[PDB]
Amino acid sequence: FKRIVQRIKDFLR
Amino acid sequence: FKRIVQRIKDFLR
């Protein structure tokens, strides 16, 4: 789940 | 949809 959150954060930054 | 994207970004910041 940490992987999934960081991917969304990186897509939107 | 801009508002929705900003709500996700702000939740994860």
Residue numbers in the entry:
A (entry chain B), B (entry chain A): 1 to 13
What does the original paper state about this entry?
Here we demonstrate that the active core peptide of hLL-37, containing residues 17–19 (hLL-3717–29), formed supra-helical highly stable fibrils that interact with bacterial cells. Rather, the fibrillar assembly of LL-3717–29 was comprised of associating four-helix bundles, each stabilized by a closely packed hydrophobic core. To conclude, the atomic structures of human and primate antibacterial LL-3717-29 showed a functional supramolecular nanostructure of densely packed amphipathic helices.
Arginine residues are lined on the surface of the bundles, with side chains extending outwards, providing an overall highly positively charged molecular electrical potential surface. The fibrillar assembly in the crystal structure created alternating hydrophobic and polar (positively charged) zigzagged belts on its surface, suggesting interactions with and disruption of negatively charged lipid bilayers, such as bacterial membranes.
